[PDB]
C-alpha cells in the first residue's frame, strides 16, 4: 500500500574525505583522510544524529581514528538537504588510539553510544606498519593491547557526550584479544529493553529509561559483526556478517536465548557489515535490510523490505545503483539505517574512491541517502 505513492529518493556525499572539496574538519583544523563505519539514529526530537571512525592518515582499521558525528540543525529538517546538517563534531579522539565501531542506541531523552577501542600501538593482525615505520603490534589478551568497549551517553539530543566510560570488564569475556561491537544500532524492544550487538554476545541494557545498567548474552556461532532487530512477532533476531565470504549468519530468539545461527542463502554478502531496520510493527509489518547483494564485492548495495512476522524471507528489494551518486568513489560497503521523522529511511552508505586501489592510501566517503518505501517497492 506504500507502493502507491510517488517514489522518492535524495542522495549526496555527508562525510567527505580529505581528497574532496570541502573535506570534512573539526572545528579544530583535524581533517580526515577517510570517514568508514557509518552509524545513523533518529532522536525522539527527530534529530538525526550520524556517525563515524575518522581515520586520520590512511583507511586503514588501526591507528589513529577518532569518533566523530554530525546533527541535523534542527529535529525537524530530517536531513533532507547538505545544508541541513552541521559541520563535524567529534565524540572520542584522545591520543593515538583506534577509538571507532559506532553503535548508538536511542531510549527517550538519552542516547547511548558504545563503541570499540585499541592502543594505538596495536593492529588486528599486527605487524602492520603505521605513519612512523612502527610496525603494530597484534592485538592480543593483555589489558593494554586487547580490544576494549566503551560506552558515552548524551542527554541534550547529541549535542555533547560524556566522557567515554570503559566497559570492558564488564562487557566483554575475560580473556578476550579481538572484539567488535556492532557497528551500526542498537534496539529498544517493544518491552523498554536495550539491545546491543556485539562480537560473540548481545549486550542487554536493563532499568528505566536513561538509567541503565547493562550485562552479557552470550551467544553460540554469533558474528563479531551482528545486527539485531525485534522482528513483527516479538522475538529477537541476529543478522551476522559471516567470517568467510558468502551469506549473511541469522538467528532468533527471546532475551533469555537465541537459537543456532545458519546461513540465509536468501541474502548473499560478501563478508561485510549490513544494517537491519524494523520499519514499522502495524500492518502491514516491516522490516528493512540492507547490505551488498553478492558473494564477492561490497559494491552491490541493496535493500530489502521482509513483511514476515519472523523475517525469513526479504523480498529482492532495490539496487541503490538505480539512484547512483557522481563523485563520491564507487559506492558500498558498510552501511546504517534509521526511520525518518518525514517517513523516510535514511540510510549512510560508505564509498570508496579506490585510488590506490585495495591500499592504504585509497580515500574513503559516506553518502547519506533517503528514501520512501515505495522507492524500494517500485524497482525492478
Ligand atoms: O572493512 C572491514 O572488513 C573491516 C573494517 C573494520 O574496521 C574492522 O574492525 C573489521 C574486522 O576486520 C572484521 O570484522 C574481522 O574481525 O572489518
Ligand atoms: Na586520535
Not at 543478522?239 to 558468502?246: K, L, T, V
Request: glycine share 12%; aromatic share 8%.
Amino acid at each position: 500500500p506504500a507502493g502507491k505513492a510517488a517514489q522518492y529518493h535524495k542522495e549526496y556525499a555527508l562525510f567527505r574525505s580529505a581528497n574532496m572539496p570541502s573535506p570534512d574538519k573539526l572545528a579544530t583544523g583535524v581533517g580526515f583522510h577517510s570517514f568508514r563505519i557509518p552509524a545513523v539514529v533518529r532522536t525522539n526530537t527527530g534529530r538525526i544524529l550520524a556517525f563515524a571512525e575518522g581515520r586520520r592518515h590512511n583507511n586503514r582499521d588501526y591507528g589513529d581514528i577518532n569518533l566523530v558525528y554530525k546533527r541535523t540543525k534542527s529535529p525537524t529538517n530530517n536531513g533532507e538537504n547538505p545544508t541541513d546538517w552541521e559541520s563535524l563534531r567529534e565524540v572520542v579522539g584522545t591520543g593515538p588510539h583506534t577509538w571507532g565501531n559506532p553503535t548508538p542506541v536511542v531510549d527517550g531523552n538519552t542516547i547511548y553510544l558504545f563503541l570499540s577501542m585499541n592502543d594505538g600501538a596495536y593492529s588486528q593482525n599486527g605487524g602492520n606498519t603505521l605513519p612512523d615505520g612502527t610496525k603494530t603490534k597484534k592485538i592480543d589478551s593483555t589489558w593494554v593491547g586487547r580490544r576494549h568497549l566503551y560506552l558515552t551517553t548524551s542527554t541534550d539530543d547529541g549535542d555533547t557526550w560524556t566522557k567515554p566510560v570503559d566497559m570492558t570488564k564488564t562487557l566483554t569475556p575475560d580473556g578476550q584479544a579481538w572484539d567488535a561491537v556492532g557497528p551500526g544500532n542498537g534496539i529498544k524492544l517493544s518491552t523498554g529493553e536495550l539491545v546491543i550487538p556485539a562480537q560473540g554476545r548481545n549486550i542487554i541494557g536493563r532499568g528505566p529509561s536513561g538509567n541503565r545498567t547493562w550485562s552479557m548474552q552470550i551467544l553460540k556461532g554469533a558474528g563479531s559483526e551482528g545486527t539485531i532487530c525485534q522482528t513483527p512477532d516479538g522475538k529477537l533476531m541476529r543478522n551476522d556478517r559471516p567470517g568467510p565470504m558468502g551469506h549473511r549468519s541469522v538467528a532468533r530468539g527471546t532475551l533469555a536465548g537465541l537459537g543456532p545461527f545458519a546461513t540465509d542463502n536468501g541474502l548473499p554478502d560478501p563478508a561485510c557489515q549490513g544494517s537491519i531496520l524494523s520499519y514499522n510493527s502495524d500492518e502491514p509489518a516491516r522490516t528493512i535490510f540492507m547490505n551488498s547483494a553478492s558473494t564477492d564485492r561490497r559494491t552491490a548495495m541493496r535493500v530489502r523490505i521482509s513483511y514476515d512476522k519472523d523475517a525469513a524471507k526479504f523480498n529482492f528489494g532495490r539496487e541503490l545503483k538505480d539512484a547512483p551518486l557522481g563523485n563520491v568513489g564507487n559506492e558500498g560497503g558498510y552501511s546504517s539505517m534509521t526511520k525518518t521523522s518525514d517517513y523516510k529511511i535514511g540510510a549512510l552508505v560508505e564509498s570508496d574512491w579506490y585510488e590506490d586501489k585495495g591500499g592504504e592510501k585509497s580515500h574513503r566517503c559516506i553518502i547519506w541517502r533517503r528514501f520512501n518505501l515505495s522507492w524500494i517497492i517500485n524497482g525492478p
